[PDB]
Each structure stands twice: as C-alpha cells, then as structure tokens.
Amino acid sequence: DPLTPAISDRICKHMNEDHASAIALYAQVFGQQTDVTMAQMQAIDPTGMDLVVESEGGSKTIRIEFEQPLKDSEDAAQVLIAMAKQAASVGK
Amino acid sequence: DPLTPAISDRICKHMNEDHASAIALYAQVFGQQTDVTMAQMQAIDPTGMDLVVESEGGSKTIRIEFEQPLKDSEDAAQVLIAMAKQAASVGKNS
Amino acid sequence: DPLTPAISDRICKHMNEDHASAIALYAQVFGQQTDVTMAQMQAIDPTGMDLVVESEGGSKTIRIEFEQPLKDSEDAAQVLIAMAKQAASVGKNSAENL
Amino acid sequence: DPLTPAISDRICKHMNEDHASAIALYAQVFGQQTDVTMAQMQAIDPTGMDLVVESEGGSKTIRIEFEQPLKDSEDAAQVLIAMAKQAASVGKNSAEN
Amino acid sequence: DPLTPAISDRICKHMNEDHASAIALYAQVFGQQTDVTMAQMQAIDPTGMDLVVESEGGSKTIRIEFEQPLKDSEDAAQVLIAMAKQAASVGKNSAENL
Amino acid sequence: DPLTPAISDRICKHMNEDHASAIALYAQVFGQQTDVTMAQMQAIDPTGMDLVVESEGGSKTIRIEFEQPLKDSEDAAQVLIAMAKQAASVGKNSAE
Amino acid sequence: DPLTPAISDRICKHMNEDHASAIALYAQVFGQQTDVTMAQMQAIDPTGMDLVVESEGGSKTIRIEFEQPLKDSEDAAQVLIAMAKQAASVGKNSA
Amino acid sequence: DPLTPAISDRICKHMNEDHASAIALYAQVFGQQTDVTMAQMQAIDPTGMDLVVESEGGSKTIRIEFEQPLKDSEDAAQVLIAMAKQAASVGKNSAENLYF
Ligand code: HEB
Ligand code: HEB
Ligand code: HEB
Ligand code: HEB
C-alpha cells in the first residue's frame, strides 16, 4: 500500500510515457477540457490526481478525484485503466 | 526493477488479474492455439515468457519469445502492450 | 481497374506464382492454422478472399475478410502487401511447445 | 500482357506509388548512384527501364537494362521483384566513408 | 587461424595480388563506385574491410563492413569469395546514361 | 503469345500443314460430321475455332467452341492436342 | 522462325513441358541410351540437337544430328514430329 | 609459406573444403579421367599433387605435375587458380556421343 512522492512520479512517468493518450482522455472526459494538447499527469495521491493541461485557457493544472480511495499503486493502475475505458465510450 | 523471479511473480499475477484477455490473445495469435478456454501466465524473463493455456480438463505448456530482449520491468510492459495491440489487430482482419 | 470476378482470377494467378509464400502466412496469422505446407489463393472478392490451406487437420478451404472493403485491383495488391507485412511481424514473435 | 508502350505507363505508375523504395534500391545497386533523393521510374521497355534521380546539376537520367528480355507485364514484375531482393541483400552489406 | 592484425596483412596481400579484380567489384557493387582504375585492399577487420579506390573522385578510402562478422582468416576467404560472386551478378545488369 | 488474329493465322497454317488429320477428327467427333474428305482450320479465337469441312452435304463452315477459354497460343496447342486424343479414343470405342 | 539461340530456348520449352515422352523416345531409338529416366532437350541447332539424359553416373549429354538440314523453326517441328513416329514404331516391336 | 607436410595438408584442406569443384575440373581435363564422382586432393608437392578420384568401377590415385616447381604456399595457390581457368575453358567445349 505505498503511495509516496517517488511512487507517484514513477506511476506518472509510465502514464506520461506509455499511456499519454489516456491522460488526454481524462482531461477531456472527466476534466471537461476540449482542446487537449500534451496532457500530462503531474502527480497522483490516494484521493486524486493532478493533470497539467494545455487548452484554450492555457498551460493550467486541474485535479480529478477518484470516487473510491486508492491504497497502493495497483489500485491506481486499475482505476486508471477503468477510467480510460469509460472515458473512451463517452468520447465516441 | 531488473531480472529477479520475485519481480516476475508480481508481473505475471498483475497480467493474470488485470489483463487476462491479453494473455488469451497471446496464445491464439502468437501461440497458434485454437481452443483457448483459460489462458494463464506462468513466468516471464528477458528471452521470452512461458504461457499455460489449459482447459476444463486439459493443459498446454507453451513458450513465446520476445524478438528483442527485455532489460527491466517497464520494457516488459512496453513489449506486452505492443504485442497485445498487434494481436488485437490480427483478430480484426480475419 | 474496378474489381471484377475476372480481375480476381488474374490477381489470384499472380499471387499463386509470385507471392505463394505470403499466402501461407495469411492462413497462419489470419486463419490461425499451425502447419504451413502449400498455400493457395482460390479466389478473391471485394469483401474477402478464399484460401485452400493444407494443414494439420488436412485440406481446408477458409475465407479471410479484409477490414476495409476493396474497390479496385490496386487496393487488392496494397491490402495483400500490407497484410503479409503484418504477418511477417507476428511470425517473428513465434512460439514453441515448452 | 505482351509488352507495349501503353502497358509501360501503367507499370511505371504502380511502381512509383506502391514500391518506390525498390526504385531507390535499383538506382544505388544497379545504377551505381550514391546521392539518391527522389528515385523515379519514367518508362519501362522490353530491353530496360529508365530511372530518374533529380539532383544538383540536373536529373539523373539513367538506363538499367534487364539481362534477359521481357515479354509481358508479368515477366517484367518477376524481373523487378528479383532485382530488388538482390538489391536488399547487397544493400545490407553496404559500404561507407 | 582466428582473426588477428597480423593475419589481416597476409590476407590483404593474397587478395591484392591474386584477386585484385574482385577488389574492384567490391568497390563498384558494395561501395557504389562507378569508375575503377586501381582498387586496393588496405586492411580487413573482424567485422569489415578498408579499400583504397584510385578512381572516380580520385584518392578515396572506403570501408565495406561485412553484414556477417568473421571468426578466422578462413571466414575472410569464404566471405570474400561469396561477396565477389554476388557482385558478379550485379555486373550482369549494366548501368548506363541517357 | 496472346491470341491475336495474326497469331491465329500462324496456328491455323501449322495445323493445316502438320496436323491436318486432327482437324478431320474435330469435325467428325465435335462437329458431328460423317464422310470428311478434306478438313481445314480457318480461324481460332479465344472462345472457339472455325472449321471448313467437306462432308455428306457440301462444303460446310462449322464452329467448335472450347469449354474453357484460351488465353495464349500455348493453351491453344494443349487444348488442340487433348481434343484430338479424345476423338482418337471415340474411334476405338465406337462402331457403326 | 529464324533459328537463333533465343528461338532454341522457346522450342526446347514446348517439347519439354509438352510431348516430353518424345525426347526420351528419341535418345532410345535414334540415340543409343538404354537407361532413360529423364530425357531433356538442352538445345536445338540447324545441324542437330543436344539431348541430355540426366543419369546416376552423369547427365548423359548426347547429340543427335538431322540428316537433312533445318531452315526455320517450322522445319524443326516437322523433323521432330516425324522422329517421334519412327520412335513409336521402333520402340514397340515384336520379340 | 615454405614447403612442409602441414603446409600441404592445409592447402589440400582449403581445397577440399572451398574449391572441391576445381579439384573435379583438374581430374577431368588434366588427368584424362571421365564420369568422375568424388574428386579429392590427397596431397600436394612442389613437383605435383596427388588426386584421389572415386569411380564406379574402382577408386583412383592420380598425379598431376606442375610444369614449373612450386616453392611456397603462395605459388601453390597461383598455379591452381590458373589450371582451374584452363579447365573451365576446356569445360565450356564439351563433347557428346553422336547418334543419327
Ligand atoms: C491507462 C491505463 C492502463 C492501461 C489501459 C494499461 C494497459 C496495459 N498494461 Fe498497464 N499499467 C498502468 C495503466 C494501464 N495499463 C499503470 C498505471 C501501471 C503501473 C505503472 C507504475 O506503477 O509505474 C501499469 C503497469 C503495467 C505493467 C507492469 C507491472 C509490474 O511492473 O509489476 C505491465 C506489464 C502492464 C501491461 C499492460 C498491458 C499488456 C496493457 C494492455 C491490455 N502494465
Ligand atoms: C504479397 C504482396 C505483394 C508483394 C510483396 C509485392 C512485391 C512487389 N511487387 Fe507486386 N503485386 C501484388 C502484390 C505484391 N507485390 C499484387 C496483388 C499485384 C497485382 C496482380 C494482378 O493484378 O494480377 C502486384 C502487381 C505488381 C506489378 C504489376 C504487374 C502487371 O502490371 O501485371 C508490378 C510491376 C509489381 C512489382 C512488385 C515489386 C518490385 C515487388 C517487390 C517490392 N507488382
Ligand atoms: C575473391 C576471393 C577468392 C576467390 C574467388 C578465390 C578462389 C580461389 N582460390 Fe583462394 N583465397 C582467398 C580468396 C579467394 N580465393 C583468400 C582470402 C585466401 C586466404 C589468404 C590468406 O590467408 O593469406 C585464399 C586462399 C587460397 C589458398 C591457400 C593458400 C595458402 O595456404 O597459402 C589456395 C591454394 C587458394 C586457391 C584458390 C583457387 C584455386 C581459387 C579459384 C579461382 N586460395
Ligand atoms: C493437334 C495438336 C498437336 C499435336 C498432336 C502436336 C504434336 C507434336 N508437336 Fe506440336 N504444335 C501444335 C499442336 C500439336 N502438336 C500447335 C498448335 C503448335 C503451335 C503452332 C504455331 O504457333 O504456329 C505446335 C508447335 C510445335 C512446335 C514448335 C514449332 C515452332 O516453333 O514453329 C514443335 C517443335 C512441335 C512438335 C511437336 C511434336 C514432336 C509432336 C508429336 C508428334 N509442335
């Protein structure tokens, strides 16, 4: 159940390097952003994640909270996977 | 996270729990297997991974090798995702 | 040239004599046959093509459908070339009985 | 499809869009040209084909002849596909300054 | 006779005096040289070869790194023989100008 | 050597000079003619051939069509040889 | 029609893909080879033809000559057709 | 380089392993042997070489002598290369049994 600054940043690097498309979906679907360009996961915490978005407003940073609290990095991956699939359906 | 049986255990249990569909795709496309009732992941290593496509009353021990060897845990996740994408594409054009 | 049953006969003839290896790949990767042996393109259609695969089971006549429909003879070659390349990548991550 | 000037137009069109990479291989291996920018198949004949590699000081108007003469459009492609495989092998064992 | 710098000098002598024509073929085929007046073999290394081409531009030292690495002096002769034969096939398709 | 009107003349002349007997068999078996004295090949098309026969009636211009269409001169020769062999077999197993 | 090395390749093809039994009959009744297992026509020239009976000891490269000279490809066909007839006659004989 | 038992074994080996065709040529042309099956270079000497041809009826040990004596291993290669081109030339002009 370890969610530290280091744990968060490796998780955010994997997402920013292997699943950058999903981060864009998070900002558009969950963060009601339209012109998503270079969406990045800045940090993730047991409660939510912080997304640096580059949209019409500019280079701002938003926060998306997870309904069920996260305990460990695995709970993060499962939630991120589920949110991306659910977000993929709304966008279509 | 470098090559170590313990790190491989967590990875094959994460895939066996979160991406069991991908394991099934591996057995059908790469393993040339037709009757996949329950495809499982027994082990992984830089050369290749070892899959077990069993059945209600059967078992298949198979080995799938990665073209380019894997060094750490994040490269294993990059190869697996890409392999699932390649297998997901084959299922479409058939 | 627009897709025609006569044009298909010409395409299948070229494939069986100049690119017979690809036909074998198509039936392993897209037809999921294990044994390879000889491989023949019996006919091609705007929706898909029919292959006669000699396999572990034996003489089988299977059909492989193209995701995007084919319009002319040129699209046939382009799809055939692309499908063979995709099979070449899968074949490179081959398997073996442990 | 017996060799005719009209057939050549079709073949050169197919090669310049679907197999332009092979045309590049032809010019370097068989044409002995090093600076390859845009390799094109202008025309093909039963004796040979004319490739164009536009470069500094004018387009490389060059002629590569097929050792054994071609009869139909199928015979042309058979020759081409084999010339490109010989070009893929040679290019692998390439040289450099 | 595993590859060594002394062994390379020996090999380059045999090729440079008994198979000097083949050296020209190497430079033309593999080194994409067109005019050849005197082709020479400076040195051979486990993975490659250094050639002096005295033609076309002029003084010109090129290197043909073999796609297959060598193990001994025998691999050099076998590789050199095979490369010359393969180069002979390209020579059969003459390249000219319009 | 794809079938062309110039190629047809070349094939028909060869057939009329080296295999005139076979042309007679075609008219009897495939053209169902009886008393053939001289048989000649006029033209060969991708789909069929024209035969000039002298039978029980007078000079007759008949047409014999090949079940499978012919593409080149080689298919013509192979088809002609097989058709002559089939006619040669009927004469062996035929009576009247 | 004019007998050229290119024409010979065309002629040998016809007699080797079709009427292949004719080539073997030739090197048996005109040629003096007894064990014929793969008779092949390598080349046709004006004076004769280079028959090759690939065998255990060696490809029996053997030459048969045409008493009457050949003029064009047509004379070749006429000469070949007639030679196969004397071969269906000498090959199948009584005792 | 200089004439030695091992020098002969490695030249005859290089020949039995890389140029077995040339050994076959040397026998047909120079040794007047015909219908050769397995031609081999048993030994090479400054004066000549000993070739072992295998024939349908009986094996053969023939000797082909070099007009000008060989001094070192390099002279051996240069002599064989020449004899092989000569035999190739004689190979192009092939005879056959005539019939009518
Ligand atoms: C977006 C969402 C998502 C998705 C969709 C995915 C999808 C995926 N994936 Fe993932 N992952 C993830 C998210 C994800 N993912 C995460 C978050 C993680 C974690 C990371 C870290 O921790 O850093 C992972 C992780 C991971 C891993 C590792 C594990 C260990 O290390 O133990 C692997 C192998 C994978 C695979 C995979 C695959 C094959 C796929 C396809 C099916 N993955
Ligand atoms: C498999 C796949 C494939 C491949 C790999 C190929 C490869 C090739 N290719 Fe190919 N193609 C093809 C498929 C193909 N292909 C097709 C399908 C076609 C069409 C045919 C018909 O139409 O018939 C062609 C066709 C063709 C042509 C045309 C001919 C005529 O016109 O008739 C040419 C020229 C060529 C070339 C070529 C080359 C050079 C190569 C190498 C790179 N192609
Ligand atoms: C180009 C390529 C090539 C070729 C073609 C050849 C071809 C030949 N070859 Fe040689 N080789 C060679 C490259 C060569 N080669 C080399 C590299 C060697 C080695 C050298 C040294 O080691 O130094 C030899 C080596 C050799 C030897 C040895 C020597 C000693 O031991 O010292 C001999 C004998 C010979 C012969 C010969 C012949 C007979 C022939 C046929 C013509 N070669
Ligand atoms: C009827 C059917 C038939 C038959 C049976 C035959 C049979 C025969 N055949 Fe014959 N062919 C023919 C039909 C035929 N065929 C044709 C169609 C041709 C083509 C012609 C033209 O193109 O003109 C020939 C062609 C021919 C040739 C070529 C010539 C030139 O180039 O000009 C020769 C060599 C011959 C041989 C022969 C022989 C040896 C025989 C056996 C006796 N053919």
Residue numbers in the entry:
A (entry chain F): 3 to 94
B (entry chain D): 3 to 96
C (entry chain E), E (entry chain H): 3 to 100
D (entry chain B): 3 to 99
F (entry chain A): 3 to 98
G (entry chain C): 3 to 97
H (entry chain G): 3 to 102
Task: List sentences quoted exactly from the publication behind this structure.
Using a phylogenomics-based approach and complementary structural techniques, we identify a family of dimeric hemoproteins comprising a domain of unknown function DUF2470. The heme iron is axially coordinated by two zinc-bound histidine residues, forming a distinct two-fold symmetric zinc-histidine-iron-histidine-zinc site. Together with structure-guided in vitro and in vivo experiments, we further demonstrate the existence of a functional link between heme binding by Dri1 (Domain related to iron 1, formerly ssr1698) and post-translational regulation of succinate dehydrogenase in the cyanobacterium Synechocystis, suggesting an iron-dependent regulatory link between photosynthesis and respiration. Given the ubiquity of proteins containing homologous domains and connections to heme metabolism across eukaryotes and prokaryotes, we propose that DRI (Domain Related to Iron; formerly DUF2470) functions at the molecular level as a heme-dependent regulatory domain. We heterologously expressed and purified the recombinant protein encoded by the Synechocystis gene dri1 (formerly known as ssr1698) and tested the heme-binding ability of this small, soluble protein (96 amino acids, 10 kDa).
His79Ala and His79Ala-Arg90Ala surprisingly bound heme. By comparison, the structure of His79Ala-Arg90Ala with heme has a similar dimer fold and interface as WT Dri1. Despite high R factors (Rwork/Rfree = 0.311/0.326) due to translational non-crystallographic symmetry, similar structural conformations were also obtained by SAXS-driven MD simulations (10−11). Curiously, the absence of Arg90 permits the heme cofactor to rotate 180° such that the propionate groups interact with Arg12 at the N-termini. The slight planar rotation of heme with respect to the monomers observed in MD simulations can explain the relatively similar heme-binding ability of His79Ala-Arg90Ala to that of the WT protein. Hence, the function of His79 can be compensated for by the other His residues; loss of the His79 axial ligands allows His16 and His21 to interact with the heme iron, therefore highlighting the variability in heme binding when His79 is absent. SEC-SAXS studies indicate little to no changes in the dimer structure. CW-EPR spectra of His79Ala-Arg90Ala show that the heme iron remains in the high-spin (g = 6; S = 5/2) state regardless of zinc addition and is not bis-axially coordinated by amino acid side chains.
